[PDB]
Design a protein around this ligand. Sequence first.
Ligand SMILES: N[C@@H](CCC(=O)O)C(=O)O
Lengths: 69, 674, 86
Amino acid sequence: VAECHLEGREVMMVTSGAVAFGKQKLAQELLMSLSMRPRAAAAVGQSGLMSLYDAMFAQYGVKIAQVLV
Amino acid sequence: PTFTERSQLKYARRLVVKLGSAVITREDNHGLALGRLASIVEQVAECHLEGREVMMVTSGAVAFGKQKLAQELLMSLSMRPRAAAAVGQSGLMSLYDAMFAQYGVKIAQVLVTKPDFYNEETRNNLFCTLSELISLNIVPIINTNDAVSPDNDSLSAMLAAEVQADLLILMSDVDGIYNKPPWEDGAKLMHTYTSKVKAATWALDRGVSVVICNGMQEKAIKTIIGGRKVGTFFTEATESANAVPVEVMAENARTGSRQMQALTPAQRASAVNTLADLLVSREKFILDANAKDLAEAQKSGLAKPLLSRLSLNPAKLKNLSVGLKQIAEDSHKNVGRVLRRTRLADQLELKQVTVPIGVLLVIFESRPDSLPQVAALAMASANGLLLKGGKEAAHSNKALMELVKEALATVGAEHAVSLVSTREEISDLLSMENHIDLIIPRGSSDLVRSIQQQSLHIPVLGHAEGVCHVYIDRDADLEKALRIARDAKCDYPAACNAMETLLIHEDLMSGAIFGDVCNMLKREGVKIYAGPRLNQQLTFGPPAAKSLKHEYGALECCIEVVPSLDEAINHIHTYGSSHTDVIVTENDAAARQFLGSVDSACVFHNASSRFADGFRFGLGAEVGISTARIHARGPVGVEGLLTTKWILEGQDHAAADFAEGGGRTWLHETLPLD
Amino acid sequence: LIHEDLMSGAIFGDVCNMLKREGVKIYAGPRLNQQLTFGPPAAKSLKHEYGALECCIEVVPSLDEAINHIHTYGSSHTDVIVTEND
Ligand SMILES: N[C@@H](CCC(=O)O)C(=O)O
């Protein structure tokens, strides 16, 4: 994607599946709650995933900006 | 809601913050003021780690993104807002993540908008998201979905509403709400309360406690959670009249002073007579009241000083009655008395007279015996008076207060007296101004010390340290000094006017009188230390004194010896609090030497430090012991509460009339003063 | 500050004339603002300070009212009374 953009074409990723990010990131509180007791994990994963994309893309110098719809 | 007073605020389990768009951006909206933001996140992490539940609502992301680009906005404003806020949203989120995680707490961005509260299915959805979050020890940051946006405060309010949160904190730039625009006399910062204002009403209408603080104020949360009077608190609970918050008290008292101003001739005299009569007539009520409150104190078992002084016996009441009758009979010509009578020129008759001070405020620990004494002082001195005791005696204080309110009601009838109970927050009390004149602390070192450390920009009568000194000269009779110091220490060794030191001529180490007085102190069981020079002197002797500027109160007395008069003088000035001292000798040359050289508040010659009682001076009933360098030294009677006021009754005189034009010259003839 | 009665004898006008003679930028008190048609401009704030040739002027009904205004605004610095009743 960074390549096709650096070429000069115009791209707008639509990354599905943030839930997995957050699900992994907690991995402890879901553990301790499934013994004493989904979307929220996706919210926290949304944050983290965004950061990760920022790091990686910026390593090509391109900048990004989260958009929610 | 349910909470009513700032006292209740240690008991809210769910909190919501909403930082303002001005507390975080620096004074450009073109960057980020960080220190404030850091303070905020630290306080928030604290309140959460406590176990309370918090959901920040950080406004103002635009500044983050605006700074982060700073280059493309540059290159576009030469070839050509919300987008910057989106990118800033991302970055700001990361930053919060780093910082919060440095306390171990985790967070999770959440985006909403005002329409998202209006439809009900989304209400369900978002509330489910929030509950699932809070259940997991996560602090969601709640920004608005700028993306869908044409100051986000209504948002936080109605958020707390849907959540039905305990307390909504709403930080901001302004300190609080005033009575009126600030460019206006009477900008009374309305701490409680019977734009932001509307939204606050709204949230209150949703059964929600709201508070609006100032961002720049440190520890604002930790401050406001304590119950401290800060920011602006909102509740119409309006339980009681609670006649004065703090201040209409003060103005009233001013009015009452103005009132009694026109009641000198036997008026206040007969009034305090009436007070003494009420004291000696209805004592049963107040006696049982103190018995009750003393029993209440017993289960508490606070302090044998307190647990001893809060006592009261009808003998004490007889003492108070005779003291009050004395004050009455002798308090005849204290006010209005003229001090100068002079004529500058024909029909130019200046004279300077006696006038009250104004709003006196006493402070003392539970000792209801003093209360009527100082009340008699006020009333005979025709000036207003406030009061604040401690915790105990409170009911006794009320009884005495009613008695004295009656007593003043007879003539003049104006209640130029009050009482500030229910934990008025002494520091806040002294934070006032423009009303109170003389802080008259009365309890003990602590009390007065805490005061002097807390008091700022307000006159504070009284001292804090009782380091006195006793010099003994080479030509002083031995047994004389023996009995003298014997009493000086062993009459009420916990007094203020005590000799926590004893200085002796170098010569008299030879006559073993040092040994004799050590024997005497032992007789009385006095833990004595030694001076560095004394440390050098003997083999091991008594142990070395810790510090020369220390205080004992109990049966302890440092002892040190120096060569000469002048050396003693210098040591005094170096360590003495200029409070009190005495010399014992038979040379009057040296006597006068000392007399002058000394700079104590009061100095004696062959007498006892325990003489500093004012009453002992025939100085009427004392009010305090002042060591300040102005207006008052040590034993202050009533006249330490009287200032002067120049008055002048000309006929047709003017300023330039005494210039070369008008035949007006100068006489300054000291008329016989009345 | 001037008694309310003496607004009738136009002495207010006389002293305005005098201040003009001396070139004194005078303001007016809220009560005085109410009093005349437009007159001198309204005083900004009663607890303000001028130093230069300026002097707010205001009139109140009674002695005691004046006293209260003084205590309200006066810095307890200095004052004088002019009258013939002792
Ligand atoms: N966006 C506005 C409200 C928009 C509206 O619904 O009128 C706010 O957050 O205060």
